[PDB]
Design an enzyme around this catalytic site. Structure first.
Site, PDB file in Angstrom:
ATOM      1  N   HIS A  40       0.746  -1.418   0.020  1.00  0.00           N
ATOM      2  CA  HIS A  40       0.007  -0.022   0.021  1.00  0.00           C
ATOM      3  C   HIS A  40       0.870   1.310  -0.043  1.00  0.00           C
ATOM      4  O   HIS A  40       0.425   2.310  -0.124  1.00  0.00           O
ATOM      5  CB  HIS A  40      -1.020  -0.181   0.987  1.00  0.00           C
ATOM      6  CG  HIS A  40      -0.405   0.375   2.440  1.00  0.00           C
ATOM      7  ND1 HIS A  40      -0.385  -0.730   3.507  1.00  0.00           N
ATOM      8  CD2 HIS A  40      -0.257   1.349   3.054  1.00  0.00           C
ATOM      9  CE1 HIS A  40       0.005  -0.050   4.601  1.00  0.00           C
ATOM     10  NE2 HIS A  40      -0.170   1.192   4.430  1.00  0.00           N
ATOM     11  N   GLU A  52      18.275   7.493   9.153  1.00  0.00           N
ATOM     12  CA  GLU A  52      17.653   8.691   9.618  1.00  0.00           C
ATOM     13  C   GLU A  52      17.238   8.593  11.032  1.00  0.00           C
ATOM     14  O   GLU A  52      16.925   7.518  11.460  1.00  0.00           O
ATOM     15  CB  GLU A  52      16.124   8.837   8.880  1.00  0.00           C
ATOM     16  CG  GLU A  52      16.301   9.083   7.341  1.00  0.00           C
ATOM     17  CD  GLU A  52      16.600  10.700   7.479  1.00  0.00           C
ATOM     18  OE1 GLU A  52      17.163  11.355   8.424  1.00  0.00           O
ATOM     19  OE2 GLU A  52      16.281  11.258   6.163  1.00  0.00           O
ATOM     20  N   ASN A  54      15.984  12.364  12.631  1.00  0.00           N
ATOM     21  CA  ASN A  54      15.056  13.387  12.469  1.00  0.00           C
ATOM     22  C   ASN A  54      15.319  13.552  11.107  1.00  0.00           C
ATOM     23  O   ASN A  54      16.288  13.700  10.109  1.00  0.00           O
ATOM     24  CB  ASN A  54      15.760  14.583  13.356  1.00  0.00           C
ATOM     25  CG  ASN A  54      14.691  15.784  13.094  1.00  0.00           C
ATOM     26  OD1 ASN A  54      14.203  16.010  11.851  1.00  0.00           O
ATOM     27  ND2 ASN A  54      14.843  16.359  13.871  1.00  0.00           N
ATOM     28  N   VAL A  57      15.813  17.035   9.609  1.00  0.00           N
ATOM     29  CA  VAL A  57      17.293  17.664   9.833  1.00  0.00           C
ATOM     30  C   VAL A  57      18.405  16.590   9.191  1.00  0.00           C
ATOM     31  O   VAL A  57      18.342  15.605   9.490  1.00  0.00           O
ATOM     32  CB  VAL A  57      17.494  18.029  11.199  1.00  0.00           C
ATOM     33  CG1 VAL A  57      18.806  18.404  11.509  1.00  0.00           C
ATOM     34  CG2 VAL A  57      16.597  18.797  11.748  1.00  0.00           C
ATOM     35  N   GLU A  62      22.872  10.104   7.208  1.00  0.00           N
ATOM     36  CA  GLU A  62      21.937   9.580   6.292  1.00  0.00           C
ATOM     37  C   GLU A  62      22.647   9.016   5.009  1.00  0.00           C
ATOM     38  O   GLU A  62      23.832   9.631   4.791  1.00  0.00           O
ATOM     39  CB  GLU A  62      21.111  10.808   5.812  1.00  0.00           C
ATOM     40  CG  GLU A  62      20.316  11.220   6.813  1.00  0.00           C
ATOM     41  CD  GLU A  62      20.782  12.227   7.807  1.00  0.00           C
ATOM     42  OE1 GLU A  62      22.180  12.520   7.746  1.00  0.00           O
ATOM     43  OE2 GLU A  62      20.317  13.098   8.498  1.00  0.00           O
ATOM     44  N   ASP A 171      -0.001   1.563  19.788  1.00  0.00           N
ATOM     45  CA  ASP A 171      -0.077   1.079  18.429  1.00  0.00           C
ATOM     46  C   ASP A 171       0.727   1.843  17.473  1.00  0.00           C
ATOM     47  O   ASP A 171       1.243   2.907  17.609  1.00  0.00           O
ATOM     48  CB  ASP A 171      -1.719   1.114  18.083  1.00  0.00           C
ATOM     49  CG  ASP A 171      -2.070   0.465  17.115  1.00  0.00           C
ATOM     50  OD1 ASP A 171      -1.715  -0.499  16.416  1.00  0.00           O
ATOM     51  OD2 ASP A 171      -3.509   0.654  16.604  1.00  0.00           O
ATOM     52  N   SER A 172       0.748   1.115  16.428  1.00  0.00           N
ATOM     53  CA  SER A 172       1.224   1.953  15.128  1.00  0.00           C
ATOM     54  C   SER A 172       0.267   2.667  14.527  1.00  0.00           C
ATOM     55  O   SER A 172      -1.160   2.777  15.113  1.00  0.00           O
ATOM     56  CB  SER A 172       2.028   0.782  14.229  1.00  0.00           C
ATOM     57  OG  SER A 172       0.837  -0.037  13.680  1.00  0.00           O
ATOM     58  N   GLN A 174      -0.985   5.660  11.088  1.00  0.00           N
ATOM     59  CA  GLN A 174      -0.670   6.460   9.732  1.00  0.00           C
ATOM     60  C   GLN A 174       0.742   6.928   9.709  1.00  0.00           C
ATOM     61  O   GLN A 174       0.962   7.564  10.669  1.00  0.00           O
ATOM     62  CB  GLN A 174      -1.776   7.523   9.541  1.00  0.00           C
ATOM     63  CG  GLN A 174      -2.156   7.449   7.943  1.00  0.00           C
ATOM     64  CD  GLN A 174      -1.497   8.877   7.229  1.00  0.00           C
ATOM     65  OE1 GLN A 174      -0.749   9.532   7.669  1.00  0.00           O
ATOM     66  NE2 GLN A 174      -1.736   8.963   5.987  1.00  0.00           N
ATOM     67  N   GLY A 175       1.421   6.755   8.749  1.00  0.00           N
ATOM     68  CA  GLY A 175       2.793   7.083   8.460  1.00  0.00           C
ATOM     69  C   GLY A 175       3.885   6.068   9.040  1.00  0.00           C
ATOM     70  O   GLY A 175       5.089   6.159   8.730  1.00  0.00           O
ATOM     71  N   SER A 177       3.333   3.002   8.094  1.00  0.00           N
ATOM     72  CA  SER A 177       2.846   1.991   7.195  1.00  0.00           C
ATOM     73  C   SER A 177       4.220   1.491   6.509  1.00  0.00           C
ATOM     74  O   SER A 177       5.185   2.442   6.250  1.00  0.00           O
ATOM     75  CB  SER A 177       2.030   2.561   6.070  1.00  0.00           C
ATOM     76  OG  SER A 177       0.818   2.721   6.224  1.00  0.00           O
ATOM     77  N   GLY A 178       4.276   0.296   6.411  1.00  0.00           N
ATOM     78  CA  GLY A 178       5.581  -0.292   5.586  1.00  0.00           C
ATOM     79  C   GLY A 178       6.776  -0.426   6.498  1.00  0.00           C
ATOM     80  O   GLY A 178       7.650  -1.397   6.182  1.00  0.00           O
TER      81      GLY A 178
HETATM   82  C1  LIG Z   1      -3.202   3.500   7.455  1.00  0.00           C
HETATM   83  O1  LIG Z   1      -2.077   2.933   8.190  1.00  0.00           O
HETATM   84  C2  LIG Z   1      -2.352   2.208   9.487  1.00  0.00           C
HETATM   85  C3  LIG Z   1      -1.533   1.724   9.985  1.00  0.00           C
HETATM   86  C4  LIG Z   1      -1.531   1.146  11.140  1.00  0.00           C
HETATM   87  C5  LIG Z   1      -2.673   1.217  11.753  1.00  0.00           C
HETATM   88  C6  LIG Z   1      -2.835   0.704  13.093  1.00  0.00           C
HETATM   89  N1  LIG Z   1      -1.845  -0.069  13.684  1.00  0.00           N
HETATM   90  N2  LIG Z   1      -3.663   0.724  13.936  1.00  0.00           N
HETATM   91  C7  LIG Z   1      -3.709   1.912  11.273  1.00  0.00           C
HETATM   92  C8  LIG Z   1      -3.609   2.805   9.965  1.00  0.00           C
HETATM   93 CA   LIG Z   2      17.640  13.358   9.150  1.00  0.00          CA
END
Ligand SMILES: COc1ccc(C(=N)N)cc1
Ligand SMILES: [Ca+2]
Length: 223
Positions: A40, A52, A54, A57, A62, A171-172, A174-175, A177-178
């Site tokens: 995705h 990485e 920061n 910066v 890097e 939790d993990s 948005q951002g 991801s991957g």
């Molecule tokens: C759109 O990406 C995500 C990734 C993880 C989670 C989650 N771990 N809750 C939700 C949305």
């Molecule tokens: Ca950096």
């Protein structure tokens, strides 16, 4: 990462940032020329940023290396997020050192109860938005398939696992991801999806990397 901690600079040396003018996904360095991420996270014009902390910066460790090729899993389904895994080949090999290092692929699938490290630059709030500039970490266990299926009826395939806390708060997001889920020094998961972030009874869902090792190895050998 919601409810995590600041990892510390270059304490997660396999963590990459995928950059298309801005950070949009994490990934994992699995050898000097290859990154694993979520399908995705696919887009054209990816720059892989290694070393990485920061991401806003230039701190000095890097490596910025353009992708030459992206391979989305042949069976990725964007509706279900089944087979949410992608390989990215770097244009040139990374220089590996104590701060930029590959993570090993698993020989075995991790059991429920295994403690893992999840990392990323994703949102740190469960409500509203706050993106950190430095890498965040979370220790979380793999949940049983039965707790995972109970949390997400009809949505968990054999290529997914849940990790985190049914109580919420950690939790993990948005951002992230991957990005990697590392257990016992092996890449076991990829940050894939979830219902919101850090919600009660809605843990994170992760691509089950141990199902993909033969695909990964065969792909890398021929590309
Ligand atoms: C759109 O990406 C995500 C990734 C993880 C989670 C989650 N771990 N809750 C939700 C949305
Ligand atoms: Ca950096």
């Amino acid at each position: 990462i919601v409810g995590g901690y600041t990892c510390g600079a270059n304490t997660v040396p396999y963590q990459v940032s995928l950059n298309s003018g801005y950070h949009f996904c994490g990934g994992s360095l699995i050898n000097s020329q290859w990154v694993v991420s979520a399908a995705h996270c696919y887009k054209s014009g990816i720059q892989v940023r290694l070393g990485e902390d920061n991401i806003n910066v230039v701190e000095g460790n890097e490596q910025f290396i353009s992708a030459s090729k992206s391979i989305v899993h042949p069976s990725y389904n964007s509706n279900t997020l089944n087979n949410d895994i992608m390989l990215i080949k770097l244009k040139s090999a990374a220089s590996l050192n104590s701060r930029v290092a590959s993570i090993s692929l698993p020989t075995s699938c991790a059991s429920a109860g295994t403690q893992c490290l999840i990392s990323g630059w994703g949102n740190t709030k469960s409500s509203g938005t706050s993106y950190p500039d430095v890498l965040k970490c979370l220790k979380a266990p793999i949940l049983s398939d039965s707790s995972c299926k109970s949390a997400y009826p009809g949505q968990i395939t054999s290529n997914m696992f849940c990790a985190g806390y049914l109580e919420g708060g950690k939790d993990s997001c948005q951002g992230d991801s991957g990005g990697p889920v590392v257990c016992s020094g092996k890449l076991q998961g990829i940050v894939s999806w979830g219902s919101g972030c850090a919600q009660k009874n809605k843990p994170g869902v992760y691509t089950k990397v141990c199902n993909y090792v033969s695909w990964i190895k065969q792909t890398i050998a021929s590309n």
